[PDB]
Amino acid sequence: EVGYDDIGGCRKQLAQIKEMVELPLRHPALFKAIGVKPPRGILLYGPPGTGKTLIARAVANETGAFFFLINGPEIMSKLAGESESNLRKAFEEAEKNAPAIIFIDELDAIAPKREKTHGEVERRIVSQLLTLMDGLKQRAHVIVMAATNRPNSIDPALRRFGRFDREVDIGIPDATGRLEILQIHTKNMKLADDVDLEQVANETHGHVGADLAALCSEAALQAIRKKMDIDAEVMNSLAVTMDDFRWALSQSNPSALRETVVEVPQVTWEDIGGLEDVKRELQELVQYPVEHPDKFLKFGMTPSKGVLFYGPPGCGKTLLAKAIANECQANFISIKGPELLTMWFGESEANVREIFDKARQAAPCVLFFDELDSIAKARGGNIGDGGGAADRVINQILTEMDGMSTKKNVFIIGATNRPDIIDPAILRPGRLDQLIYIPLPDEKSRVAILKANLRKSPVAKDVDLEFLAKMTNGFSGADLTEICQRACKLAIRESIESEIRRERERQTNPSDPVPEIRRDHFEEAMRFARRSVSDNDIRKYEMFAQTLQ
Amino acid sequence: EVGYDDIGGCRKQLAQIKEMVELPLRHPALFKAIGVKPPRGILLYGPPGTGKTLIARAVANETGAFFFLINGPEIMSKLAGESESNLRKAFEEAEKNAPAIIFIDELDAIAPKREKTHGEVERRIVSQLLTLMDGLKQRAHVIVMAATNRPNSIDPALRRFGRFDREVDIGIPDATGRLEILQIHTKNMKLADDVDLEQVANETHGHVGADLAALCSEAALQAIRKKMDIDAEVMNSLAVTMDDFRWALSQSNPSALRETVVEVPQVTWEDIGGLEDVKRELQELVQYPVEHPDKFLKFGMTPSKGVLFYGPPGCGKTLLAKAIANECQANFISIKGPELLTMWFGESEANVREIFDKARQAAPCVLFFDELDSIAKARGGNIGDGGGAADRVINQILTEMDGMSTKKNVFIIGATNRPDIIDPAILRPGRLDQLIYIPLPDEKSRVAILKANLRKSPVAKDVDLEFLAKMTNGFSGADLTEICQRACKLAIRESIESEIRRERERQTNPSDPVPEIRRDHFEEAMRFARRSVSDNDIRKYEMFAQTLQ
Ligand SMILES: CCCCCCSc1nnc(COc2cc(F)c(C#CCNC(=O)CC)cc2F)n1-c1cccnc1
Ligand SMILES: CCCCCCSc1nnc(COc2cc(F)c(C#CCNC(=O)CC)cc2F)n1-c1cccnc1
Ligand SMILES: Nc1ncnc2c1ncn2[C@@H]1O[C@H](COP(=O)(O)OP(=O)(O)O)[C@@H](O)[C@H]1O
Ligand SMILES: Nc1ncnc2c1ncn2[C@@H]1O[C@H](COP(=O)(O)OP(=O)(O)O)[C@@H](O)[C@H]1O
Ligand SMILES: Nc1ncnc2c1ncn2[C@@H]1O[C@H](COP(=O)(O)OP(=O)(O)O)[C@@H](O)[C@H]1O
Ligand SMILES: Nc1ncnc2c1ncn2[C@@H]1O[C@H](COP(=O)(O)OP(=O)(O)O)[C@@H](O)[C@H]1O
């Protein structure tokens, strides 16, 4: 017995499921009278152990309609001739009792791709499912929900309209999502109040709901370990501590890892520092078009869907993209350059189709291509010994973007660091056409940069950031954060040494730690760190701008 | 009849199995009351003949719960329709008697990958296993342990949560592990006390437990050979000698060989010699973060998970990595450069996924990439005629490291010998960012180098190491150990000649050997050996440092 309370983190997708499953069953009269056909099939997918079955059970219980789970493994387990008979009688009994939510779990196993169905019985059961789904077009209220993984894995015949009209990408839960999952799974534990259940959540990046349940179980198991060997005083005094969740997190690998995260970033224009002019430009390029479509219709100009950041390597490209995504409260589909390089090397571009389809599934998206044309940098860079500017994977990206100029809800951003090797085919209308030269931080900006970076970390009042900013003239944002991290490392090394010697003194014959960062650490760090981008590079970018501006 | 005593070397993994199999069966009450779901499936894998079946039997006998071994071969041997019936009735009788440890041996054979299951009956039995494992979710206490090899070989559907939650990488036993195995298998032998049973253990690198049992049997068989043809005086006087284990070791090839070893090194900061500053740096980069996480949380700086050693080719890179791993009592997943070159040439990067997954399975790891960007050296080196700095396999390594910044228990080390060809994509936060320029040994250091190398070998008092160190100014550590080995070779050649002439004199008409190394051998060796790294190379590394520092 579960319900809407049990599901956590899944809110947008759960909201869609609520929308799509409540009205056709709880209130079928108005749909029948109006004549609009409700979605017969609802294919919700995602990585394994994401709560697909749990979501289906919860929505079925909340609706109160008749429910009949169907599992792909058990259907396939039966002898030939009995699997299709079982499916047929399941659909029949659903029809006889039909305010109904049929649920086909692991649809991929029962109905994989056409060419990877090796046996004849496999194709027979697939066709049986097809004909049952088509024949349940009758007005009897049955909704055939299906759970799978990698929706491209199932036979595309099922994805055709009239069988599975609507798709739901559950995806990985975000930070708040993982916090909700942990709250749900740690409700009946009597956990010690010392743990927060939120510090662990932010550190469980890439964990899926099943992995979070496993982490909670492993933390409880570590709590058992800490206890020796009595029946009442051990089960009553059990209180999982933060030191137990730490162990569970350490000894628990994520499963749905390195799958492109569909999440809202958490920079909100404050992690980024100043630049005082590109914030307004990004707002006007992506905030005004959505806030005031009427004006854009009046003067008759299609808003630019693409922006290609270019500048010194590391000055706030990814930070700008994340910040503008957060301001719009939109998903941010990060695509690092290494994955594009793997795309080019793997000789497989269908994964680009997959990535763009997943971006399209997330309605408000800020699809971000970091290190764009890193493929050009790989194939000889400026020399171009491999060939011309155009290359393999960027061609597929161009095709998809040309096809993705109609969604008008996925703002594509590019962050090439070497604009001179950018293939000109992508600087065309309908593609990343708007060019914003985010420059190296200025004197007035570096103080804000350091204030943002030193945030969330104690800092003494002695340090004067203005003089440090003037001292670091041509330093890039990456170099500024490197200086901050180096100073922090020096300060923590000093603190650790102080604590070690204090403990040694206390334990020996005898029987403040400077909990702040002071200017000596900052200057010591400055001695080491140096600007990583040469004057030649910024001159080259300025020359590119002059070619444009 | 076996038990915990029989299992040897497997302690960490056996400890995990004890944890995971005792409490759910011996004390099921507290788990039921608390509500945390114990791990239903426990997939323990490793190379063949590693004791997987033996470990399962031992834990089952120690628990005392009902046990029912299931073998993949015999299940598959039955006629179609009888294999699934056999599996079903096995699960049923386990349920009827269910404090239970079901054991599916050779899970790969019964349930291989989805696409490599050719017949329809194969898929039917796989689905039968899936549905049985899902349907045994009931509170009846059955634990479905499974033994396999290369866990990527089994159908990934089984690895999903709720079926096989927990994975156990048994791995090769270490030196102490092989010693324990030999002790177990040589308990009832009446072996002669002359043999130590530990000299053989250190020389059986890559041997698996089954191979160790075979080695013991072959040693006993050689002992039989030495005996001619009586029933009592031959079986009672049998005493295997070290000369028999020597033969067995010689005529016994390892099976689980050249599989990346998950073992703790044995250098413990003493095999390495001095350098007097990078020991502290490594300690502060990997020892302080784990010892004092609270300070790292206070000042708010994510500790650097990666370090990229760079310097003259051969000065203690691998030695430093092994030493820092040993100091932390952590596994050391060595990855030599040749295997990366094979990765690049093989056109297969899924093995990089496999390597990183295996590293993640070992919780405390010091993953070490020796000769990093040797691929760059292969594709034209500094010229880069092949193309840009970025290449094929290092891209996959970068992706995995980006995904491996959350484990916070696998410290990644790189030991590039040519930093100028290192792809800059790996010198970024979240990757191998901290750079430590381990230099050529100094005058004060070479004496320690020679003291360490000459250790465990007799040395005369006449040799003066300080003058030799001054004589070898720019010599690298590889060159110093080469000098030591050459001097030892000259000394042992002299000793062998002396012994040969002494034996010849004794055997002829007539009827100290200098058991030490003296300065004449050292100077004779010095005449030959010369520094292998030129002044140009060290100047280049210094220039790289100046570009950084
Ligand atoms: C959203 C959260 C931040 C990140 C992603 C969302 S971005 C977003 N959300 N909604 C929109 C608005 O889309 C459009 C509105 C229009 F009026 C028009 C028009 C017109 C006039 N036609 C003609 O004259 C001839 C036919 C075209 C649009 F595409 N955009 C958007 C689209 C494009 C660029 N920037 C923003
Ligand atoms: C272990 C045996 C030797 C070889 C392998 C083991 S190495 C090991 N074992 N435990 C650890 C500690 O991990 C971490 C601890 C932390 F406090 C933090 C933090 C923080 C602050 N967050 C923020 O401000 C914003 C979110 C991050 C960690 F990743 N490490 C380790 C990790 C990284 C580098 N060096 C060592
Ligand atoms: N959104 C969620 N809310 C609560 N629990 C979840 C959620 N997602 C996953 N889980 C947990 O993960 C597990 C998923 O198990 P299962 O249903 O077998 O796999 P799947 O969810 O992929 O079908 C459940 O035990 C559930 O408690
Ligand atoms: N304008 C900025 N404000 C604050 N931090 C910045 C800024 N630019 C760069 N950084 C720092 O640099 C890091 C991110 O670098 P990024 O700008 O993403 O590199 P790239 O532009 O090559 O993607 C962050 O840790 C961030 O703190
Ligand atoms: N950790 C261990 N302790 C004792 N013996 C072992 C160990 N590992 C392997 N062996 C030996 O290796 C053999 C393994 O045989 P078998 O069980 O058929 O293969 P596997 O162990 O891979 O299932 C046994 O005879 C056992 O004596
Ligand atoms: N600092 C050192 N102390 C002791 N031995 C060293 C040192 N540096 C190199 N060696 C010797 O060199 C050999 C290992 O070479 P290594 O440093 O691994 O080469 P590389 O650094 O190219 O991987 C060992 O036999 C070791 O005795």
Numbering used by the authors:
A (entry chain A), B (entry chain B): 200 to 428, 437 to 718, 726 to 763
From the paper:
To investigate the structure of the R155H NTD mutant with triazole-class inhibitors, we used single-particle cryo-EM to solve the structure of p97R155H proteins with NSC804515 and NSC819701. NSC804515 and NSC819701 share the same pyridyl triazole core and cyclohexenyl thioether but differ in substituents at their termini. Compared to NSC799462, NSC804515 has a 2,5-difluoro substitution pattern on the aryl ring rather than a 3,5-pattern, and a propionamide at its terminus rather than a carbamate, reducing its length (27.4 Å) compared to NSC799462 (30.1 Å). When bound to NSC804515, although the NTD densities were fragmented and did not allow us to build their peptidyl backbones, the NTDs are oriented in the up conformations, as shown for other p97 NTD mutant structures. The NTD mutations, including R155H, could disrupt the interactions between the NTD and N-D1 linker and between the NTD and D1 domain, thus favoring the NTD up conformation. The terminal group of NSC804515 can interact with the adjacent D2 domain, whereas the 1,2,3-triazole on NSC819701 can interact with the residues on the helices α1 M and α1 J limiting their relative motion and enforcing the NTD down conformation in the R155H mutant. The IC50 values for p97WT and p97R155H mutant are also similar for all three triazole compounds, whereas the IC50 for K512N is 7.5 to 12-fold higher for NSC819701 and NSC804515, respectively. In general, when comparing these mutants to p97WT, NSC804515 and NSC819701 were all more than 30-fold resistant to P510S, N616F, and F618S and only 7- to 12-fold resistant to K512N.
Human p97 ATPase is crucial in various cellular processes, making it a target for inhibitors to treat cancers, neurological, and infectious diseases. The molecular mechanism of p97 ATPase has been extensively studied with a variety of methods, including X-ray crystallography, nuclear magnetic resonance (NMR) spectroscopy, and single-particle cryogenic electron microscopy (cryo-EM). These approaches have revealed a dynamic molecular machine with three distinct functional domains: an NTD and two ATPase domains, termed D1 and D229–31, each harboring conserved Walker A and B motifs typically associated with ATP binding and hydrolysis. A stable and functional oligomer of six p97 monomers assembles without a requirement for binding nucleotides. This homohexamer structure appears as two concentric rings, formed by the D1 and D2 domains, that create a central pore capable of binding protein and peptide substrates for segregation or degradation. The triazole inhibitors bind between the D1 and D2 domains and at the interface with an adjacent monomer.
